[PDB]
Amino acid sequence: GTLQTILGGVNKHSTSIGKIWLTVLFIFRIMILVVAAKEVWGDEQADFVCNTLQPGCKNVCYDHYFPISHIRLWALQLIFVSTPALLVAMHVAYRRHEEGSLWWTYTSSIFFRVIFEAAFMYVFYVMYDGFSMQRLVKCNAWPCPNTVDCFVSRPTEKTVFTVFMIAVSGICILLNVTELCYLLIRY
Amino acid sequence: GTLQTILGGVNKHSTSIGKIWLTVLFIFRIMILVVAAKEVWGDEQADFVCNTLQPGCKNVCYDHYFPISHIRLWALQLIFVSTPALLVAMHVAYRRHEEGSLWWTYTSSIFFRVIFEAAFMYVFYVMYDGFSMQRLVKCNAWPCPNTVDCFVSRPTEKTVFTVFMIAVSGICILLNVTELCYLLIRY
Amino acid sequence: GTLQTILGGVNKHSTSIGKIWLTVLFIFRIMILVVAAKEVWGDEQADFVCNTLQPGCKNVCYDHYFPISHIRLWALQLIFVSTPALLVAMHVAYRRHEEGSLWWTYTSSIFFRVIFEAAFMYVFYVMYDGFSMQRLVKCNAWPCPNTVDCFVSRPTEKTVFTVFMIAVSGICILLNVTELCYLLIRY
Amino acid sequence: GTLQTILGGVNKHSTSIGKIWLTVLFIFRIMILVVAAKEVWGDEQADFVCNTLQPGCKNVCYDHYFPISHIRLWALQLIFVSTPALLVAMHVAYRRHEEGSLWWTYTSSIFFRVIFEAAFMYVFYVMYDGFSMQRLVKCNAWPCPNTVDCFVSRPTEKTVFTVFMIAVSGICILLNVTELCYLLIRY
Amino acid sequence: GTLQTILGGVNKHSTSIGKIWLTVLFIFRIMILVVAAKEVWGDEQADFVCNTLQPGCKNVCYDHYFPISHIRLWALQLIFVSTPALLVAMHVAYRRHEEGSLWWTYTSSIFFRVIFEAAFMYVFYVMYDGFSMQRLVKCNAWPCPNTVDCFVSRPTEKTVFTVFMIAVSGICILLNVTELCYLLIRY
Amino acid sequence: GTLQTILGGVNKHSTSIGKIWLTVLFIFRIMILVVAAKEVWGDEQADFVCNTLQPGCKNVCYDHYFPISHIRLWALQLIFVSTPALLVAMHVAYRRHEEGSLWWTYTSSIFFRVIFEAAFMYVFYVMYDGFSMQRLVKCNAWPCPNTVDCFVSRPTEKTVFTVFMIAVSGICILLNVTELCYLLIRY
C-alpha cells in the first residue's frame, strides 16, 4: 500500500549499517516472499500424491511431514524481527511528543533481532532436517497400512527458495553483530 | 488501505501502556490473522474426508464438529474489542467539536475490553474442548450409518496458530487489568 | 479504499445518536459482511448434495430453496439504507455551494431508513421461514422423481451470522425511532 | 479507487436534476453491478448442465442461448452513457484553459444519453425475449442429437437483478426527458 | 490506481484532436479490456473439449489454433502505442528541467502510433484468418490420431469483443492520419 | 500502488540514457510480467499430462524438467537489478540528510546491473537449453517405468514471451555498456 512513508520514518534514527543495509536486506526478503515464493507453495497439499487406497492416509501423512508450511514460518519470522524496530518508533515519538535511555533501548532493540533470527533458523533445521526437500517420503502413521510411498510437489524449486532465504537471514545476523561490536568497543 | 491515520488518531489520548503495548499487540493479531492464518483454513471443508458411501454424511459431520470456524470466531473477537476504542474517538470529537466525564468513559472503555476477551476465550474452550485439534473425529449423526471415521485437514498447523492467538489474547487481558489497577489506586 | 473521508464528511451534521451510534453500528455491519461472512457462503452451491441420479435435479432444488442468497440480500439492504444519508450530503452541498428546509429533509431522511430496515427484515422472515437454517431439505420439483433428499453446506455457521445480522439491524431500528421521538416532542 | 474527485468535478456544471438525481442513480447502478451482481453470474457456464453424452454439446448450447452475458451488456451500457458527460468535462476545460456553444454541447450531451439507454434496453428485450430467465432450455444445434434438455444456474436470482437494472434504467430515461423539456419550453 | 494525474499531465501539450478524442478512445479500450473482456477469456483452455481418448491431444490442438490469446495481443498493442506518448513527456520534462526540435519529436511520435496500430491489426488478420471465431476446429497434429473434432468455449461472445476492438482501433488510425494532414499542409 | 513517486525520485540524479531509456525499459518489463505473462504460466502443472498409470510419475517428471518456473526466474531478476538503483537513493539521502564518492558509487552501481543481467541470461540458456519450449518431453526418472511421454501446456505462447523478455534484457545490457563508455573516455 503506502509502505514508503512507514519505512521512510524508520529510515532515519539509525547508523550507517542500520540505515542502509539492514533495511535493504529486509524489504529484499519481503519481496521474495510476496511476489515469488507464495505461489510455489500454493498447491502443496492439492498435489501431494500417495500410493494407496486407504481413505484418510493422505491427510495424516501430509500433516506428519509438514507440521507447518515453510512460508508460514517465514511470515512469522518477519513479523517478529520487525516489531523491535517499530517499538522504538513509538517510544521515541512518545518521548518527543511531551543519551542513556535512548542508548539502552537501541542496544536492546538490535539484541532481540539477533535472538529471533537465530531461533527461527534453528527451528528450520531440526523440524525439516536440513535445507533440502526430498521427492519421496515414507509414512506409517495410522490409518496407513504398513508403509506408504508419498510424493512431494515441486521439491527442487522449494529447495532453491529455502537456500535463498536462509542465506539472506544469515547475512542479517552478521550485520547485526558488527553494529553491536562498533558500539561495544566505543563504550 | 490507509489504516495508518486511523490508529494514528487512536494512538494519542492514552496512557503509557495504552498508547504503546495494547496497540502493538492489537495490530500484531490482525497481521497473524490476515497474512498467515486465513489460508491455513482455506480448504477446511474441501479436504475433510469421511470413510463412507452415504450421500450427505460428509456435510452433517463437518457441520457437527465445526459449528463455526476458528478464523470467523477470531474475526468477530477483533471487531468487538476494537469498538469501545472507536467510540471514545467519536465521543471526544463530539465533545471537542462544539475530567469526570472523560474519566468515566475511559474507565468503562477498558472495562468492556476485558469482558469481551474473557468471553471469547471461554467460547473457544467449551466449543472445541481445549486448544488442540485432533486428526480423527467419529460421527454418528443421521444419515451416517452407525459411526463413521472422518479426517481433519492440517490439524497440527491449526493447533500452532490456535495456541499463538490464545497466548497473545491472554497477555492483552493482563495489560488491561494493570492499567485499571493504576487508576484504581490513584483514586 | 479511502472510505475514511467519506464517512468523515457524513460524520458531521448529525445529532448525538446520529453522529456516533448509528455510524458505528453501520460500519459494524459492513465489516461482518466483508471480512467474515462472504467466505461462509462461498461454496453454497458447489457443496449442495442431493441423493439422486437424475440430471438437473440439483440445479432446480438449489434454486427452489434459495431464490436469493443471504449475502446478496444483506448487500442490497446496506445500499438502500445508506443512500438517504448520501442524498443530504449532496443536497446540503448544493445549497451551500451557491431551518425548515433542512429540517424536513433530515426528518424524512431518517424516516426512510426505518422503512427499508423493516422491509428487509420482513423479507428475511417470510422467504426463509424463520432465522434458522436446516440440514436437510426435501424437494419435489420437476425433473426430480418423487421426493429427493438434499443437504445444505455449513448450516450451523450460517445460522450464527444470520442471528447476528438480524440483531444488529433490530437495534438500528430502535435508535432511529428514539431520534425521531426526540424531534417529535421538541416540535 | 479515488473516484470521489472525478464525479466531484462532474458534480458541478449541471442543473437541479442533473446535479443530484442523475448522478445518484448512476453510482447506484455501478454499486449493484459491482458489489452484488458480478458473483451471481460467476458460475454461469461451469454450472450449466445438459442431459447428454455427446462431447461438445454443452459448449454449443450455452453459446446459442447466451450470445453475450447480461453483466457484460450492462458494463458496456454504463461505459457508453458515461462518455458524453466526460466529453463536456474536457471540452469545457479546453475552453477555460486558453452561451450558445455551451448550450449546444449540453443539450446534445443529454440527447445521446437517451439514445444509448433506449438502445440497450431494446437489445435486452429481443435477445433474451423478455426479462424472465427460464429454468430449462431445449437445444438442437449440431452436434447435439435430436433435442437436448439443458438447465440454467440460478435462474430466479438472475431474474431479480434483471428487473432491478431495467427499472432503474427506465427511470433515468424519464429524468433525462424532463430536463430536456425544461430547456425546450425555456427557448 | 492514481492514473488520473498521469493522463492529466499527458492531457496538456496536444492539439484539439490529440487532447480530446485520442485520449478518450484510448481509455475507452483499456476499460473494455479490463472490466469486461478479461473474464470472457478466463476459461479458454479449461473448457476446450476434444472428442478423443488420446492423452495429450487436447494440449497440442489448443496450442496449434491459439498460438497467442487475443487478450494478450491486445495488452501488448496498448503498451506499444502508449510509449511514444510517454517518451515526449520525459523528453520535454528533460528539456524544461535544465520549435523545430519539439516539432520533429511530436510529428515522429504520432508517426509510430500509426505504424504499431496497423501492424497489430495485420497480425490479427493473418493469424486468426478473419475476425470471426468458429465453434468447431479440426486438428491432426501428432499425437492426435487421424483428425479430431474440438470445440471452442464461448465463440459468439469472443466475436463480439473482437469486432468492437478492431473497430475502435480502426478509428484511432483515421484520427492520427488527419492530425498528420493538418500539420502537413501547414508546413 | 503509489509507485509513481518512488520512480519519480529515482527519475532524477541520472544522465540522459539513465534517466529515460533505462527506466522506460524497466517498467516495460514489469508490465509484461504482471499484466500478461503471469496467467500464461497459471496452469503449468495442472495441465501437464503424462501417458502412464504409475502414481507419482507426473510429480517427478514435472519437477525434473522445470526445476524453477520461468516467471519466478524473471521475478528474481527484476528484484536483483533494481536494488543497486535503490541503494544510491538511500546512500545519497543519507549523505544529504546530515564528486569522487558519488562517482564511485554511481559507476559501481551500473557495473552490478550488467553482472546480474548477464548472469540470469546465462542461467536461462543452460537450464532450459535454448529459448524454445517443446511440446513433448521424455522422462525416465524413478518411479516412471522405462520412458514416459509427457506433454507441456501452451508451449508456443510461452516461447513468444520468453523471446520477448530476453530481447528487452539484451537491450538493457547494451545501454548500460554505453553509459559506462561515456564516463570511461571522459576520465
Is C68 at the interface with chain D, CB within 8 A? Answer: yes
Is D40 at the interface with chain E, CB within 8 A? Answer: no
Residue D48: left (phi > 0), alpha (psi -120 to 50), or beta?
beta
Is F4 at the interface with chain A, CB within 8 A? Answer: no
Whether the CB-CB separation of A25 and A175 falls below 8 Å is answered with: yes
Query: Helices marked H in chain D — which ranges?
Result: 3-11, 16-17, 23-31, 57-65, 70-97, 100-128, 155-186
Q: Which residue from D149, C164, D81, A178 is spatially nearest to B79, judged by alpha carbons?
A: C164
Is E45 at the interface with chain F, CB within 8 A? Answer: yes
- Please state, in angstroms and rounded to a whole number, the distance separating the CA atoms of residues D123 and D76: 12
User: How does DSSP classify residue F129?
Assistant: T
- Please state, in angstroms and rounded to a whole number, the distance separating the CA atoms of residues B11 and D46: 49
User: How does DSSP classify residue F39?
Assistant: G
**Residue among D1, D47, D153 minimizing CB distance to C1:** D1
Sheet of C148-151, strand order: C49-50, C148-151, C136-139
Please name the residue that has the C-alpha cell 496450442: E63
Residue of chain B nearest A83, judged by CA positions:
B24
Q: Which residues contact A76 (CB under 8 A, 6 or more apart)?
A: A120, B32, B36
Q: Which residues of A are annotated as a binding site?
A: 39, 42, 44
Q: Which residue from F176, F186, F157, F185 is spatially nearest to F70, judged by alpha carbons?
A: F157
User: How does DSSP classify residue B134?
Assistant: -
**Residue F143: domain span:** 1-187
- Please state, in angstroms and rounded to a whole number, the distance separating the CA atoms of residues F123 and F181: 26
**Torsion sign, CA atoms B164, B168, B171, B173:** negative
Is F75 at the interface with chain A, CB within 8 A? Answer: yes
Q: What does the angle CA B25 – CA B27 – CA B28 come to, to the nearest 5 degrees?
A: 55
User: How does DSSP classify residue B15?
Assistant: -
Whether the CB-CB separation of F72 and F128 falls below 8 Å is answered with: no
- Identify the burial level of B60 via C-beta atoms within 10 angstroms of its C-beta, where 0-12 means exposed, 13-18 middle and 19 or more buried: buried
DSSP SS3 for F148: strand
Grid coordinates of F131: 529459448
User: How does DSSP classify residue F160?
Assistant: H
B27 CA: distance to closest CA in chain A (Å): 11
Which residues face B149 on adjacent strands? B138
CB < 8 Å to B73, chain C: none
Whether residues E157 and D63 touch (CB distance < 8 A) is answered with yes
Whether residues E36 and D72 touch (CB distance < 8 A) is answered with yes
CB < 8 Å to C59, chain D: 47, 49, 135, 151-153
Suggest the residue from D5, D10, D19 to mutate for an interface test with chain C (most C CBs closer than 10 A): D19
Q: What does the angle CA E118 – CA E123 – CA E127 come to, to the nearest 5 degrees?
A: 160
Q: Which residues contact A160 (CB under 8 A, 6 or more apart)?
A: F67, F68
Q: CB count, 10 Å around CB of D169?
A: 19
What count of Cα atoms within 13 Å lies in the side-chain half-sphere of residue F163? 7
Please name the residue that has the C-alpha cell 423493516: C118
- Please state, in angstroms and rounded to a whole number, the distance separating the CA atoms of residues F73 and C72: 42
Whether the CB-CB separation of B29 and A41 falls below 8 Å is answered with: no
**Residue among A1, A60, A87 minimizing CB distance to B1:** A1
Q: Which residue from A11, A169, A173, A152 is spatially nearest to A76, judged by alpha carbons?
A: A169
Q: CB count, 10 Å around CB of F40?
A: 19
**Residue among D75, D87, D90 minimizing CB distance to E36:** D75
For chain A, count helices (H), then strands (E). 7, 3
**Phi, psi (5° rounding) for residue E149?**
-85, 130
- Identify the burial level of D158 via C-beta atoms within 10 angstroms of its C-beta, where 0-12 means exposed, 13-18 middle and 19 or more buried: buried
DSSP SS3 for A67: coil
The H or E element spanning position E73 is helix E70-97
Suggest the residue from F4, F76, F95, F96 to mutate for an interface test with chain A (most A CBs closer than 10 A): F76
Q: Which residue from E43, D39, E35, A1 is spatially nearest to F39, judged by alpha carbons?
A: E43
- Please state, in angstroms and rounded to a whole number, the distance separating the CA atoms of residues E106 and F119: 38
DSSP string, A6-47: HHHHHHSS--HHIIIIIHHHHHHHHHIIIIIGGGTSTTTTTT
- Please state, in angstroms and rounded to a whole number, the distance separating the CA atoms of residues E121 and E115: 10
- Please state, in angstroms and rounded to a whole number, the distance separating the CA atoms of residues C79 and D157: 18
Grid coordinates of C63: 434454486
The H or E element spanning position A130 is none
Q: Which residues contact C154 (CB under 8 A, 6 or more apart)?
A: B45, B62, B63, C40, C47
Crossing angle (nearest 10°) for helices A70-97 and A23-31:
140
Please name the residue that has the C-alpha cell 528484484: F79
- Go through chain E and tell me how many residues it has: 187
Grid coordinates of A167: 542465506
Q: State the pairing for strand pair E49-50/D136-139.
A: unpaired
Whether the CB-CB separation of E117 and E169 falls below 8 Å is answered with: yes
User: How does DSSP classify residue F138?
Assistant: E
User: How does DSSP classify residue D39?
Assistant: G
Which residues face D148 on adjacent strands? D139
Cα distances (Å, whole numbers) of residue B181 to B116, B175, B176, B177, B178:
19, 10, 9, 6, 5
Whether the CB-CB separation of B172 and B166 falls below 8 Å is answered with: no
Task: Convert chain C into a string of H (helix), E (strand) and C (coil).
Answer: CCHHHHHHHHHCCCCHHHHHHHHHHHHHHHHHHHHHHHHCCCCCCCCCEECCCCCCHHHHHHHHHCCCCHHHHHHHHHHHHHHHHHHHHHHHHHHHHCCHHHHHHHHHHHHHHHHHHHHHHHHHHHHHCCCCCCCEEEECCCCCCCCEEEECCCHHHHHHHHHHHHHHHHHHHHHHHHHHHHHHHHC
Neighboring chains of C (3 or more beta-carbon pairs < 8 A) = B, D
Is E35 at the interface with chain D, CB within 8 A? Answer: yes
Experimental resolution (Å): 2.2
DSSP SS3 for B179: helix
Is B151 at the interface with chain A, CB within 8 A? Answer: yes
Is A69 at the interface with chain B, CB within 8 A? Answer: yes
Q: Which residues contact B83 (CB under 8 A, 6 or more apart)?
A: C24, C28
**CA torsion, points E127, E128, E129, E130, in degrees to nearest 10?**
-130
Whether residues C90 and D157 touch (CB distance < 8 A) is answered with no
Total domains in the fold of chain C: 1
Please name the residue that has the C-alpha cell 428487473: D163
Q: Which residue from B128, B113, B155 is spatially nearest to B29, judged by alpha carbons?
A: B113
Q: Which residues contact E103 (CB under 8 A, 6 or more apart)?
A: none
Q: Which residues of D108-125 are buried (b: 16+ CB within 10 A; e: fewer)?
A: ebbebbbebbeebbeebe
Report whether E99 belongs to an annotated binding site: no
DSSP SS3 for E151: strand
Q: CB count, 10 Å around CB of D65?
A: 16
CA-based R_g, chain E, Å: 21
- Please state, in angstroms and rounded to a whole number, the distance separating the CA atoms of residues B179 and B164: 23
Whether residues A154 and F45 touch (CB distance < 8 A) is answered with yes
Suggest the residue from C48, C151, C159 to mutate for an interface test with chain B (most B CBs closer than 10 A): C151
Q: Which residues contact A171 (CB under 8 A, 6 or more apart)?
A: A25
Grid coordinates of B69: 470456524
Is E7 at the interface with chain F, CB within 8 A? Answer: no
Query: Helices marked H in E98-154 — which ranges?
Result: 100-128
- Maximal C-alpha separation, chain B: 69
**Residue among D4, D136, D157 minimizing CB distance to C6:** D4
Q: CB count, 10 Å around CB of E35?
A: 18
Chain breaks in chain D (C to N over 2.5 A) after: 98
Whether the CB-CB separation of E110 and E179 falls below 8 Å is answered with: yes
- Please state, in angstroms and rounded to a whole number, the distance separating the CA atoms of residues A171 and B6: 36
User: How does DSSP classify residue A82?
Assistant: H
The H or E element spanning position A147 is none
- Please state, in angstroms and rounded to a whole number, the distance separating the CA atoms of residues B75 and B78: 5
- Please state, in angstroms and rounded to a whole number, the distance separating the CA atoms of residues B108 and B104: 6
- Please state, in angstroms and rounded to a whole number, the distance separating the CA atoms of residues C76 and D40: 13
**Torsion sign, CA atoms B22, B27, B28, B30:** positive
Cα distances (Å, whole numbers) of residue A46 to A50, A115, A141, F60:
11, 35, 20, 15
The answer to whether B and C touch (≥3 CB pairs < 8 Å) is yes
F156 CA: distance to closest CA in chain E (Å): 6
- Please state, in angstroms and rounded to a whole number, the distance separating the CA atoms of residues A134 and A150: 11
| D143 preceded by a cis bond (ω within 30 of 0) | yes
User: How does DSSP classify residue A2?
Assistant: -
- Maximal C-alpha separation, chain E: 69
Q: Which residues contact C129 (CB under 8 A, 6 or more apart)?
A: none
Q: Which residues of C142-164 are buried (b: 16+ CB within 10 A; e: fewer)?
A: ebbeeebbbbbbbbbbbbbbbee
Residue of chain B nearest C133, judged by CA positions:
B63
- Identify the burial level of E110 via C-beta atoms within 10 angstroms of its C-beta, where 0-12 means exposed, 13-18 middle and 19 or more buried: buried
Grid coordinates of B102: 472523560
CB < 8 Å to F43, chain E: 45-46
Whether residues E136 and D56 touch (CB distance < 8 A) is answered with yes
Which residues face E148 on adjacent strands? E139
Whether the CB-CB separation of E31 and D79 falls below 8 Å is answered with: yes
Q: Which residues contact C9 (CB under 8 A, 6 or more apart)?
A: C89
- Please state, in angstroms and rounded to a whole number, the distance separating the CA atoms of residues F11 and F171: 20
Grid coordinates of B147: 459411526
Q: Which residue from E99, E116, E113 is spatially nearest to E23, judged by alpha carbons?
A: E113
- Please state, in angstroms and rounded to a whole number, the distance separating the CA atoms of residues C111 and C184: 12
Taking a contact as any Cβ pair under 8 Å apart, which residues of chain A between 106 and 145 contact chain F?
135-136
Whether the CB-CB separation of E10 and E27 falls below 8 Å is answered with: no
- Go through chain B and tell me how many residues it has: 187
The H or E element spanning position B91 is helix B70-97
Q: Which residue from C82, C81, C93 is spatially nearest to C13, judged by alpha carbons?
A: C93
Q: CB count, 10 Å around CB of F169?
A: 19
- Please state, in angstroms and rounded to a whole number, the distance separating the CA atoms of residues E87 and E109: 8
Cα distances (Å, whole numbers) of residue E40 to E35, E160, F142:
10, 11, 41
Whether the CB-CB separation of D4 and C8 falls below 8 Å is answered with: no
